[PDB]
Design an enzyme around this catalytic site. Structure first.
Site, PDB file in Angstrom:
ATOM      1  N   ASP A 123      15.811   9.310  78.589  1.00 49.40           N
ATOM      2  CA  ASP A 123      15.001   8.125  78.889  1.00 49.40           C
ATOM      3  C   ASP A 123      15.042   7.762  80.363  1.00 49.40           C
ATOM      4  O   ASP A 123      15.985   7.108  80.840  1.00 49.40           O
ATOM      5  CB  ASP A 123      15.426   6.946  78.013  1.00 49.40           C
ATOM      6  N   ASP A 135       8.135   7.073  82.539  1.00 47.89           N
ATOM      7  CA  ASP A 135       9.133   6.689  81.547  1.00 47.89           C
ATOM      8  C   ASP A 135       9.100   7.655  80.363  1.00 47.89           C
ATOM      9  O   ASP A 135       8.253   7.540  79.459  1.00 47.89           O
ATOM     10  CB  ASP A 135       8.900   5.236  81.079  1.00 47.89           C
TER      11      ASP A 135
HETATM   12  C1  5MS Z   1      13.729   4.259  74.696  1.00 50.05           C
HETATM   13  C2  5MS Z   1      13.724   3.990  73.210  1.00 50.05           C
HETATM   14  C3  5MS Z   1      14.410   2.868  72.756  1.00 50.05           C
HETATM   15  C4  5MS Z   1      14.445   2.551  71.399  1.00 50.05           C
HETATM   16  C5  5MS Z   1      13.793   3.348  70.459  1.00 50.05           C
HETATM   17  N1  5MS Z   1      13.797   3.076  69.145  1.00 50.05           N
HETATM   18  C6  5MS Z   1      12.803   2.665  68.339  1.00 50.05           C
HETATM   19  C7  5MS Z   1      13.139   2.241  67.046  1.00 50.05           C
HETATM   20  C8  5MS Z   1      12.124   1.811  66.184  1.00 50.05           C
HETATM   21  C9  5MS Z   1      12.359   1.323  64.774  1.00 50.05           C
HETATM   22  C10 5MS Z   1      11.448   0.443  64.156  1.00 50.05           C
HETATM   23  C11 5MS Z   1      11.636  -0.030  62.850  1.00 50.05           C
HETATM   24  C12 5MS Z   1      12.763   0.367  62.124  1.00 50.05           C
HETATM   25  C13 5MS Z   1      13.688   1.237  62.715  1.00 50.05           C
HETATM   26  C14 5MS Z   1      13.484   1.703  64.019  1.00 50.05           C
HETATM   27  N2  5MS Z   1      10.830   1.807  66.612  1.00 50.05           N
HETATM   28  C15 5MS Z   1      10.580   2.239  67.874  1.00 50.05           C
HETATM   29  N3  5MS Z   1      11.508   2.665  68.759  1.00 50.05           N
HETATM   30  C16 5MS Z   1      13.097   4.474  70.921  1.00 50.05           C
HETATM   31  C17 5MS Z   1      13.054   4.804  72.280  1.00 50.05           C
HETATM   32  N4  5MS Z   1      12.380   5.891  72.733  1.00 50.05           N
HETATM   33  S1  5MS Z   1      11.435   7.000  71.832  1.00 50.05           S
HETATM   34  C18 5MS Z   1      10.062   6.097  71.371  1.00 50.05           C
HETATM   35  O1  5MS Z   1      10.853   8.133  72.945  1.00 50.05           O
HETATM   36  O2  5MS Z   1      12.243   7.516  70.430  1.00 50.05           O
END
Ligand code: 5MS
Length: 373
Positions: A36, A221
């Site tokens: 990230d 990002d």
């Molecule tokens: C930086 C980053 C931070 C956090 C997350 N995590 C999530 C988690 C959930 C989620 C929603 C409902 C229930 C459980 C989990 N939805 C979106 N992102 C992903 C990325 N990055 S990524 C998008 O490239 O995996």
């Protein structure tokens, strides 16, 4: 190439980021760690969670040093809380080094871990300015450059679709791209901040004041899926994207990401959707370059049915050039020289008619005005 062992060291699932294996502690504990560039903390799941297969056990690590200080990182979807310490950290398919780095053990989370993402932590690769609890907490990459000979540079090749790619640490692999690399300054070292100077849809200038493209910031990002555009920018882009693809009709909610559209396996008419160009400030006065993505980048596959989400979305914290942008390109985070290079990715998804592009130079006057103060 001399960096051959770092090639293809990333895995992922579409829409859920790209992760690298990092080995923590003594004796070793290896975890899948989200790459990230849009944050600066190194944190790992450190207690059981329904969405985690494995996690960090500090009690089993003889080299763990507790910093005796809590840490909390919010995001828009939820957050995590945890405890700071230092431990030994290396990357099996990264540089041939081990450092003592700051690590936040995550003990509680809310909507952080993704069910099925196969990652168990996050590696924030941006700068100390945005680190939590504050900028005194040295980010992983700052440690690595500080404690070792590794050049202050990484590069990312993100291969869209179950995905993969390469993080080359300490240099550049020429097999990851084609053509020239073009550089844009890093405006300020916090987020990987950049300046967008023009937007075109199928060659057609969006004709907005460049100040709007960068309100209140534009960043690169890797931890964000979408190309996120400021409200006013997004609206004008949607309208122009609609106008370019008008041989087909799509519901209002498709363009808002609320509705999906599926084609029969193998039939997505990519060619009815426009190419999208973002011009970036170059390294010479009045000089710019453009990067161009295909609908293969911005339409994200989510049966004998191919479903897609429109992955250009609305933002109120500026432009986020997420995986949607990165997946066309080999992206060089040249920290040593305060700049970011783009070249055409050797692995990017195209067809026989159109390919992603990095082109220049162009003349763009008054580019020093586009940035927000
Ligand atoms: C930086 C980053 C931070 C956090 C997350 N995590 C999530 C988690 C959930 C989620 C929603 C409902 C229930 C459980 C989990 N939805 C979106 N992102 C992903 C990325 N990055 S990524 C998008 O490239 O995996």
């Amino acid at each position: 190439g001399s960096f051959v062992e770092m090639v293809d060291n990333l895995r992922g699932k579409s829409g859920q980021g790209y992760y690298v294996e990092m080995t923590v502690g003594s004796p070793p504990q290896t975890l899948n760690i989200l790459v990230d560039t849009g944050s600066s903390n190194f944190a790992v799941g450190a207690a059981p969670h329904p969405f985690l297969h494995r996690y960090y056990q500090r009690q089993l690590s003889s080299t763990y040093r507790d910093l005796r200080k809590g840490v909390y990182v919010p995001y828009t979807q939820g957050a995590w809380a945890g405890e700071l310490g230092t431990d030994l950290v290396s990357i099996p398919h990264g540089p041939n080094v081990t450092v003592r780095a700051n690590i936040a053990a995550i003990t509680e989370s809310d909507k952080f871990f993704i069910n099925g993402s196969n990652w168990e932590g996050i590696l924030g690769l941006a700068y100390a300015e945005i680190a939590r609890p504050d900028d005194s907490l040295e980010p992983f990459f700052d440690s690595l450059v500080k404690q070792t000979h590794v050049p202050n540079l990484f590069s990312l090749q993100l291969c869209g679709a179950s995905v993969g790619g390469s993080m080359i640490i300490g240099g550049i692999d020429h097999s990851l791209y084609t053509g020239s690399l073009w550089y844009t300054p890093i405006r300020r070292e916090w987020y990987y901040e950049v300046i967008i100077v023009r937007v075109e849809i199928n060659g057609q200038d969006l004709k907005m004041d460049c100040k709007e493209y960068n309100y209140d910031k534009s960043i690169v990002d890797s931890g964000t899926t979408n190309l996120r555009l400021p409200k006013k920018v997004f609206e004008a882009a949607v309208k122009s994207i609609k106008a370019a693809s008008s041989t087909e009709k799509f519901p209002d909610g498709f363009w808002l990401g609320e509705q999906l559209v599926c084609w029969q396996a193998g039939t997505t008419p990519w060619n009815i959707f426009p190419v999208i160009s973002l011009y970036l400030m170059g390294e010479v006065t009045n000089q710019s370059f453009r990067i161009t993505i295909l609908p293969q980048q911005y339409l994200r596959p989510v049966s004998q049915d191919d479903c897609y989400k429109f992955a250009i979305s609305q933002s109120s914290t500026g432009t986020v050039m997420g995986a949607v942008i990165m997946e066309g390109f080999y992206v060089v985070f040249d920290r040593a020289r305060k700049r970011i290079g783009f070249a055409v990715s050797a692995c990017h998804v195209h067809d026989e008619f159109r390919t992603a592009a990095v082109e220049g130079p162009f003349v763009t006057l008054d580019m020093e005005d586009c940035g927000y103060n």
